[PDB]
Design an enzyme around this catalytic site. Structure first.
Site, short mmCIF file in Angstrom:
data_model
loop_
_atom_site.label_atom_id
_atom_site.label_comp_id
_atom_site.label_asym_id
_atom_site.label_seq_id
_atom_site.Cartn_x
_atom_site.Cartn_y
_atom_site.Cartn_z
N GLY A 89 3.07 3.40 -2.08
CA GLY A 89 3.12 2.83 -2.94
C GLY A 89 1.48 3.49 -4.15
N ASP A 98 -2.32 12.62 6.61
CA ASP A 98 -1.57 12.97 5.79
C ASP A 98 -0.64 12.66 7.62
OD1 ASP A 98 -2.24 13.05 3.69
OD2 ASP A 98 -0.99 14.89 3.41
N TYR A 146 -1.60 22.20 1.24
CA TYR A 146 -2.23 22.75 2.48
C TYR A 146 -1.24 23.34 3.23
CZ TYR A 146 -0.55 18.16 4.17
OH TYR A 146 -0.56 17.37 4.33
N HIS A 154 -4.03 5.11 5.37
CA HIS A 154 -3.98 6.42 4.68
C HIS A 154 -4.93 6.55 3.88
CE1 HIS A 154 -1.63 9.23 2.28
NE2 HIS A 154 -1.48 9.74 3.59
N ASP A 155 -4.25 5.21 2.64
CA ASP A 155 -5.10 5.26 1.65
C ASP A 155 -7.13 5.24 1.80
OD1 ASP A 155 -2.73 5.00 -0.15
OD2 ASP A 155 -3.70 2.49 -0.01
N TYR A 197 0.95 -1.41 -0.03
CA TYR A 197 0.20 -0.01 0.38
C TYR A 197 0.80 1.37 -0.38
CZ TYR A 197 -4.11 -2.40 0.36
OH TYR A 197 -5.03 -3.65 -0.25
N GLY A 243 -1.68 2.82 -5.93
CA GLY A 243 -3.35 1.82 -5.32
C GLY A 243 -2.76 0.81 -4.40
N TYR A 300 -8.27 8.46 2.05
CA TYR A 300 -7.92 9.99 1.33
C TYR A 300 -8.94 9.17 -0.16
CZ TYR A 300 -3.39 11.86 0.54
OH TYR A 300 -2.45 12.88 1.28
C1 LIG Z 1 5.39 11.27 -0.21
C2 LIG Z 1 4.84 10.00 0.28
C3 LIG Z 1 4.42 8.93 0.08
C4 LIG Z 1 3.68 7.73 -0.40
C5 LIG Z 1 3.88 7.87 -2.17
C6 LIG Z 1 3.35 6.82 -2.85
C7 LIG Z 1 3.34 8.28 -4.80
C8 LIG Z 1 2.32 7.60 -5.30
O1 LIG Z 1 1.01 7.75 -5.57
O2 LIG Z 1 2.54 6.14 -5.88
C9 LIG Z 1 1.76 7.40 -1.95
N1 LIG Z 1 0.15 7.32 -3.05
C10 LIG Z 1 -0.80 7.49 -1.54
C11 LIG Z 1 -2.12 7.10 -1.63
C12 LIG Z 1 -3.66 7.76 -0.78
N2 LIG Z 1 -4.42 6.76 -1.66
O3 LIG Z 1 -3.47 7.27 0.20
C13 LIG Z 1 -0.71 7.59 -0.76
C14 LIG Z 1 1.16 7.25 -0.52
C15 LIG Z 1 2.44 8.14 0.33
#
Ligand SMILES: CCCc1cc(CC(=O)O)c2[nH]c(CC(N)=O)cc2c1
Lengths: 121, 121
Positions: free
Chosen positions: B29, B89, B64, B47-48, B27, B31, B51
């Protein structure tokens, strides 16, 4: 620098950095705007963001040493810049490899106007 | 945006968000599918989910502002979207920090094909 990054790319993907990863999608190349078009393009976007965390370095010209140990890329101890740039490059080349299954020639020589917007990182 | 999130991650963990957390497990990264690999990966799962509950916002790109007061992150007073993204975040950066004790290098550069299945929020 591209010398080392390119070597990694070839070793991991069987593709030459120029041109396979130098005009692909919105981010594999130079210039940086738009929404990445696919997984390979996302690798490139992340690569740019990785470099972006290193404002006091110069990845176009900063050379570094890496070796292969037990089959894996090892970023040898050097300066902070050399190590960080190397890790960025290593992560991207491996990302390219992991996503070879969706590498699409339709995204090569990808036109500018198909990539609009700023994606901050 | 990634910009603010990464800054929080650095402040809380001492690691550059890219590349330390940008390819971790299933997770952390792009998707996400499958069972999170460990505590850190669960941080990203959550976190996903956070969001994903902000459909009226653009969590990855929306900018922000935040501040640090008495050693801890404080999300400003901004738009509703800005405040919620900031809190998603903040919770994640702190979660990473709280779980550094089990952060494992073997989950870096984790290939997505190893992650399959719906894990509902
Ligand atoms: C700067 C931080 C590190 C990291 C990297 C990716 C980046 C991209 O969407 O691949 C990330 N994409 C998300 C997506 C969201 N669904 O939480 C969280 C996240 C955390």
């Amino acid at each position: 620098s591209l010398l080392e990054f390119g070597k990694m790319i070839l070793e991991e993907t069987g593709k030459l950095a120029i041109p396979s990863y130098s005009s692909y999608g919105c981010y594999c190349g130079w210039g940086g705007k738009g929404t990445p078009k696919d997984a390979t393009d996302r690798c490139c976007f992340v690569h740019d963001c990785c470099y972006g965390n290193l404002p006091d370095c110069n990845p176009k010209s900063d050379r570094y040493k890496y070796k292969r140990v037990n089959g894996a890329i090892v970023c040898e101890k050097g300066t902070s810049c050399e190590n960080r740039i190397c890790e960025c490059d290593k992560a991207a080349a491996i990302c390219f490899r992991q996503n070879l299954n969706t590498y699409s020639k339709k995204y090569m020589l990808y036109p500018d106007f198909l990539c609009k917007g700023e994606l901050k990182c």
